[PDB]
Design a protein around this nucleic acid. Structure first.
Lengths: 98, 411, 108, 76, 423, 94, 80, 78
DNA sequence: TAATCCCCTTGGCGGTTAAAACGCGGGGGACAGCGCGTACGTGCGTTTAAGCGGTGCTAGAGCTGTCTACGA
DNA sequence: TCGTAGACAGCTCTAGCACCGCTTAAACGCACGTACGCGCTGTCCCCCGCGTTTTAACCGCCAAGGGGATTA
């Protein structure tokens, strides 16, 4: 029908999302990369399920505060579109990678 | 009567501060030799229309259309040149001084060869369209682009105007002068100077940015140097061209043609020249149908256009093996590439500094680790520019490379 | 022994103070520990967790529902003041996010 | 090295204590460490904000630069 | 004009050598228009700047035109003549272009020094009468010099005269003052008789309107006795009673014609109309912030209505719009207002007789003035100041009909009940 | 059923003294049982270093409450001070 | 094998809208992948050492306890 | 009191911070942030002395204070 | 503390629908440019209070007997 | 139920504590030219919006196994 006004669709999206919590990420498409990464450190390392579940929680948990920090950086930038500049700058505040 | 006259020192104004020539007279017209180039122009009695004595020389108007702006004369040349003239012409010189009001209100007349502008029967200029190079219009912009043929003194570059709407008109005969195969044609060019996405085709003595809003030319004379530089992630590549003069919008200047390519710029090209003719022009190098990395594929053609060598990014691996680092400079933090003979600062602005032109360099320190080092460079022209935000390993790589360039570090 | 009249019953509370001091003798943080030191912290925890549950019941009234969900917790703690600054670095399992919409993200 | 002069600083530092507990004595020596910790949480406290101003593309500074990075530091 | 004669020459014959030139006494630039050395009156010229690359410079000179003399009123006697806007010269450095470029700005200074703007009030009738209101320890702000001027104030049958120590007389008429107000030194730094004029009168260096007279009650020295506070009481109370008697003397001459209203510090708040949070106070006809320099004196009579700004969560400091009656007077924003003083200022508006509005929203206020100075009812054609209020828009749906949760919710609940203990 | 000495049951009572009927996710019961230990540790290690600083091998409740004054802000800190104080003096009365 | 691309652009977008942002730019994707996986590796590295300290052959959730103890980024309720 | 934070001392910090144009409200802005940074490090120091039951305050108080602050630097044997 | 095991992890999968990806249509928002007015930095007079040399000044940190009482 | 860490005096003594001059280097404020913040822009452009294809990720169901928990 009428393609929707800008933002209004995404406003309904974020209103749908701010209540919700559960995983936006699949299990085995994530697990496959995780087991791939773990073998690079060392072979012969099995996983349990629940640790991977908690890590799939924890990675999203790390990313989401980063996302809102990046959003506040765009609020500073006063532009609708997101920017690659900010994250490094956020890490320039966070002292993560130098 | 007398048959000639001579002044080997008098000028004639040709498009700015043109220097001396050689007045010679004759009983039908004028033999003006150039004392610079030996160029002799001749005027006869069938040509004479007008001459008026201003602030000083024969400011003549003939039936060649020409505006003979002779100058470098003394005051009573008004007599003695007229002493050669007196018998025939039926023309004397007024003391005009066409206008000295300094008041803007007048009318422009498109001259048949010139461009006159009047303040109520009192004009200020009658300028031929040879004196302009190119021209754009606007509202109310009237752009008269003046490119000097290299006089070291004062040279006019641009005069724009308040012309009213030119109701039922425009810059008509203003835009009526000199006209300034496509060898190859490009598609989807990520333009950075100016910003946008336009294309450039390749013309016999120049090139052309074809675009949607603007449309620009790239002469083979105006180039200075092929620069070939990457992005530091090597996902992109910086296609920069050292140029002189910059191109303008009237407001900004484009000293360096900056373009952005990716690493993915990989396609075949087909040159619109014959297989003997590609090396009749190229000489054994650039064939009709080559391919590959367009950042290199285009620039191979660009080298044979410039007939000048390749600027290569250095092998200096700074922090994390990167070939550069960013630094805070001029409302921006941009990368600084080391080179064979210089440094280049992307992006806004592009600033190149050669090694030899540097007088010295110096540092400045805060106390904490977080990029407290503040590094400035003073050139031999007296100018010094300051580039902050340097870490300690960045200082190690920097300081070692500067010492490898044996540069005067004031400390 | 006799009747197990608890030290915690002599504190009138719930936490296993003898087992708490047993846990204290695991990390073994000094050669001796005062007897009220397991009492004091257990009292503190039983106090503060009760306030946490009191706020969680308020959030359940906000939910108008029955079972406490983990999304209530950011509804409690990320709406709190002393705990929110106090547990800022703490990430919350299945906590959700707070409803935080910017006014610049709104139309004319 | 050192920017803040001693006595108007340290009289105000001693002025803080009565809000917590009045009538207390102090090392003169401890005050210098407080100066160091102060100027420690001054310069790096300013550098990030200068990075915000260059992300603001400005020569001057604003409190929007101030309040942002402290939240990005997790201070508030 | 630039010149009148060919014999009105440049000060040097330049086109034999092609050198730049300014004629100062005729106030004109003389530049070759491709060899045509033409003069130009400075009053027809905007400005000048410089760029350079290598040694090759570029001196742009913008000239006055519609677009430069205006935005494209005219004191310029032709609407539709062809003008110029700018020129741009290029030379190099083997110099004087910059050295004459620096001479240009003070020519702009000397012209507008020569061509300035040109309030002369009536000469105050000094009368050394019986009830002559005179008072001591009186300082003026703004001062005659940059130094803080000392003297006494002497009220007369038609106004005030701040006779300085030097004898300088400050004639302040009855019809000049709009808002004569008095703030006591009650927990203050001064005790001020402000006299908000209606005419910026020329004295000292400038033409001033908000002029105040004050007596400091400060405390901080940089050189437990209970006589220091009692000496402070002697300097405050036992002198402010004589200050009230001076109020009685100046109103033994006005008889409350030129009033001195009481501050409302119960309604006074540390807000920022001059973008610095000082103690505003209402009076009987003026919300005044004359406690510090400069004094904010607003006429409450010329206020159409009041829009409260930033009436929203997490805003302890909010703002307010003084929607004036005279929209030609620029709308000022009283800022950093406490939330506790919301309803007190509202009740003050109920005493100010204004049906007010609130909001969080903001817009370009000069744009709203240009909307409303074209027609005093034309912004009232937009619903008036109900445009401040919302009006929503059309859409598809809110689409939150199935706003539910886990129908198959988790069975995590009562763990157990079987338990025991030890020691 | 996972018979380890996480607490999980005093919670199961002290809700019922403030909300006698409210269901709970046992997930959140585990959240709080972890949360107990999460503050137990930051009491314990800092109590250890404070017992080191005076060079005193004993840890009584003043050593607890000083770390409490460190670790908890304001009036709820003072409330916890009062509630621990009344309990310690209650076992002093025993 | 290419499982870094296992995270999808719309899942990235649902994270961004759960992150509560307004407009997408497609450049952020691999950036976020790199910022993600390296921090993951920072966790995984000393996480391996914990099971090696337990001398076992299988990763448990006791590992991420001490991992977040090193991070100061702890969750709750995950002792089992 | 807090007015003793002189603008040129602020500019010494700002040019040590490498900032050249500085807004005037930042002067009064940072003064409260100073006190915020003070009060945490002073409160636990008071707590340290009260636990140490003394009349005087040491720099070891600052040592153990900045440890809890996560704001630990060194320079005087610690 | 060496056997024992059963209580956890795994290779690839039958089914098939909600989710992932390219593209066509079209539209939404950055952005460098044009002024244009403006406030903090520089030069400088002025204050002037602060670092330091010196006073008199006394109450608090520190370790040694001691014998003991709450944790072990 | 034996034990030793530490609170209660006690001496030492000394690290500060509060001022008065010297003087002398550091901050306040007046005046001012200006580099830069700010409003309107216009132009191109880069994701919505499905459209269509696809496609692969997850439930029911299979056995295979394996290594950490669990018992004197």
């Amino acid at each position: 029908p009428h393609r929707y006004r800008p933002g209004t669709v995404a406003l309904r999206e974020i209103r749908r999302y701010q209540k919700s919590t559960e995983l936006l990420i699949r299990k085995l498409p994530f697990q496959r990369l995780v087991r791939e990464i773990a073998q690079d450190f060392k072979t012969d390392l099995r996983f349990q399920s629940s640790a991977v579940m908690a890590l799939q929680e924890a990675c999203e948990a790390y990313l989401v505060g980063l996302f809102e920090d990046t959003n506040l950086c765009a609020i500073h930038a006063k532009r609708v579109t997101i920017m690659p500049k900010d994250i490094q700058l956020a890490r320039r505040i966070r002292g993560e990678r130098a | 009567m007398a048959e000639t006259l001579e002044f080997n020192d008098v000028y004639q104004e040709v498009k700015g501060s043109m220097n001396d020539g050689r007045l010679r007279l004759s009983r039908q017209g004028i033999i003006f030799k150039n004392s610079k180039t030996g160029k002799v122009d001749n005027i006869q009695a069938g040509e004479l229309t007008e001459g008026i004595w201003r602030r000083h020389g024969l400011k003549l108007l003939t039936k060649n259309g020409h505006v003979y702006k002779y100058d470098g004369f003394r005051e009573s040349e008004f007599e003695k040149l007229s002493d050669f003239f007196k018998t025939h012409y039926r023309l004397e010189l007024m003391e005009k001084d066409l206008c000295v009001k300094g008041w803007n209100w007048g009318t422009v007349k498109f001259g048949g060869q010139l461009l006159s502008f009047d303040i109520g029967d009192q004009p200020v200029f009658e300028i031929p369209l040879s004196n302009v190079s190119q021209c754009t219009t606007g509202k109310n912009e009237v752009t008269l682009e003046f490119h000097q043929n290299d006089d070291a003194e004062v040279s006019l570059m641009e005069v724009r105007f308040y012309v009213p709407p030119t109701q039922x008109x425009x810059x008509x005969x203003x835009x009526x002068x000199x006209x300034x195969d496509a060898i190859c044609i490009f598609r989807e060019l990520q333009c950075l100077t100016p910003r946008g996405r336009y294309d450039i085709r390749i013309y016999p003595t120049f090139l052309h940015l074809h675009g949607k809003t603007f449309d620009y030319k790239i002469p083979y004379t105006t180039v200075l140097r092929l620069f070939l530089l990457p992005h530091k992630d090597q996902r992109q590549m910086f296609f920069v061209i050292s140029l002189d003069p910059p191109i303008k919008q009237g407001q900004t200047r484009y000293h360096f043609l900056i373009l952005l390519f990716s690493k993915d710029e990989d396609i075949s090209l087909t040159l619109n020249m014959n297989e003997e003719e590609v090396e009749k022009r190229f000489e054994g190098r650039l064939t009709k149908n080559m391919s590959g990395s367009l950042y290199e594929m285009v620039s191979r053609v660009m080298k044979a256009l410039v007939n000048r060598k390749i600027t290569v990014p250095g092998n200096f691996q700074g922090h994390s093996g990167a070939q550069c680092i960013t630094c805070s400079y001029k409302a921006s933090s941009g990368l600084l590439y080391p080179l064979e003979r210089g440094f280049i600062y992307v992006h806004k602005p592009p600033v190149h500094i050669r090694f030899d032109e540097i007088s010295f360099v110096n540092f400045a320190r805060g106390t904490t680790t977080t990029r407290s080092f503040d590094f400035e460079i003073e050139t031999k022209q007296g100018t010094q520019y300051t580039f902050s935000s340097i870490e300690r390993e960045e200082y190690g790589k920097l300081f070692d490379f500067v010492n490898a360039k044996k540069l005067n570090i004031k400390n | 022994r006799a009747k197990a009249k608890s030290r915690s019953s002599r504190a009138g509370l719930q936490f296993p103070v003898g087992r708490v001091h047993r846990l204290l003798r695991k990390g073994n943080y000094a050669e001796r520990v005062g007897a009220g030191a397991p009492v004091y912290l257990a009292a503190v925890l039983e106090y503060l967790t009760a306030e946490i549950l009191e706020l969680a019941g308020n959030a359940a009234r906000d939910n108008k529902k029955t079972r406490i969900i983990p999304r209530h917790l950011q509804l409690a703690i990320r709406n709190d003041e002393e705990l929110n600054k106090l547990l800022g670095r703490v990430t919350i399992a299945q906590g959700g996010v707070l409803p935080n919409i910017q006014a610049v993200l709104l139309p004319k | 090295e050192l920017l803040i002069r001693k006595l108007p600083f340290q009289r105000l530092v001693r002025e803080i204590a009565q809000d917590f507990k009045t009538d207390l004595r102090f090392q003169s020596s401890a005050v210098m460490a407080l100066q160091e910790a102060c100027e420690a949480y001054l310069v790096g406290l300013f550098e990030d904000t200068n990075l915000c101003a260059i992300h603001a593309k400005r020569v001057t500074i604003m409190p929007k630069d101030i309040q942002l990075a402290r939240r990005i530091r997790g201070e508030r | 004009v630039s010149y009148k004669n060919p014999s009105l020459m440049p000060k040097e014959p330049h086109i034999r050598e092609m050198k730049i030139y300014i004629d100062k006494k005729y106030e004109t630039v003389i530049m070759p228009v491709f060899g045509i050395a033409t003069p130009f009156h400075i009053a027809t010229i905007k400005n000048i700047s410089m760029s350079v690359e290598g040694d090759y410079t570029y001196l742009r000179i913008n000239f006055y035109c519609p677009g430069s003399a205006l935005g494209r009123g005219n004191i310029f006697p032709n609407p539709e003549a062809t003008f110029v806007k700018e020129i741009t010269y290029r030379a190099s450095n083997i110099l004087n272009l910059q050295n004459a470029f620096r001479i240009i700005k003070e020519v702009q200074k000397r012209y507008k020094x020569x061509x300035x703007x040109x309030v002369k009030q009536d000469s105050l009738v000094i009368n050394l009468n019986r009830s002559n209101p005179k008072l001591k320890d009186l300082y003026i702000r703004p001062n005659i010099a940059q130094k803080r001027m000392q003297g006494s104030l002497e009220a007369h049958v038609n106004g005030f005269r701040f006779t300085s120590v030097r004898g300088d007389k400050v004639d302040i008429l009855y019809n000049n003052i709009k808002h004569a107000l008095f703030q006591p030194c009650d927990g203050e730094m001064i005790i001020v008789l402000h006299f908000h004029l209606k005419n910026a009168i020329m004295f000292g260096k400038k033409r001033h309107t908000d002029v105040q007279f004050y007596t400091e009650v400060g405390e901080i020295t940089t050189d437990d006795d209970l006589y220091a506070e009692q000496m402070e009481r002697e300097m405050r109370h036992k002198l402010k009673t004589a200050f009230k008697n001076f109020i009685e003397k100046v109103e033994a001459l006005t008889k409350e014609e030129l009033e001195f209203e009481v501050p409302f510090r119960d309604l006074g708040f540390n807000g920022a109309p001059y973008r610095s949070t000082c103690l505003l106070q209402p009076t009987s006809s003026a919300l005044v912030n004359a406690t510090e320099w400069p004094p904010f004196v607003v006429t409450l009579d010329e206020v159409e209505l009041i829009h409260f700004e930033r009436v929203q969560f997490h805003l302890k400091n909010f703002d307010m719009v003084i929607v004036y009656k005279d929209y030609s007077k620029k709308v000022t924003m009283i800022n950093a207002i406490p939330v506790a003083s919301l309803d007190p200022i509202k009740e003050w508006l109920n005493s100010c007789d204004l049906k007010y509005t609130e909001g969080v929203q903001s817009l370009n206020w000069t744009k709203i003035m240009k909307t409303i100075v074209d027609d005093p009812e034309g912004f009232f054609e937009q619903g008036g100041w109900s445009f401040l209020x919302x009006x929503x828009x059309x859409x598809x749906x809110x689409x939150x009909x199935x706003x539910x949760x886990x129908x198959x919710x988790x069975x995590x609940x009562x763990x157990x009940x079987x338990x025991x203990x030890x020691x | 059923r996972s018979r380890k000495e996480s607490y999980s049951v005093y919670v199961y009572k002290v809700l019922k003294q403030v909300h006698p009927d409210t269901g709970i996710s046992s997930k959140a019961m585990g959240i709080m049982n972890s949360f107990v230990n999460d503050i137990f540790e930051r009491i314990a290690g800092e109590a250890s270093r404070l017992a080191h600083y005076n060079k005193r091998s004993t840890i009584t409740s003043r050593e607890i409450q000083t770390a409490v004054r460190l670790l908890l802000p304001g009036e709820l800190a003072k409330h916890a001070v009062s509630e621990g104080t009344k309990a310690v003096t209650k076992y002093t009365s025993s | 094998r290419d499982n870094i691309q296992g995270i999808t652009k719309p899942a990235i977008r649902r994270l961004a809208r759960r992150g509560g942002v307004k407009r997408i730019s497609g450049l952020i994707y691999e950036e976020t992948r790199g910022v993600l996986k390296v921090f993951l590796e920072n966790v995984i590295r000393d996480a391996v050492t914990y099971t090696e300290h337990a001398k076992r052959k299988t990763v448990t959730a006791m590992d991420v306890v001490y991992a977040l103890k090193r991070q100061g980024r702890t969750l709750y309720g995950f002792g089992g």
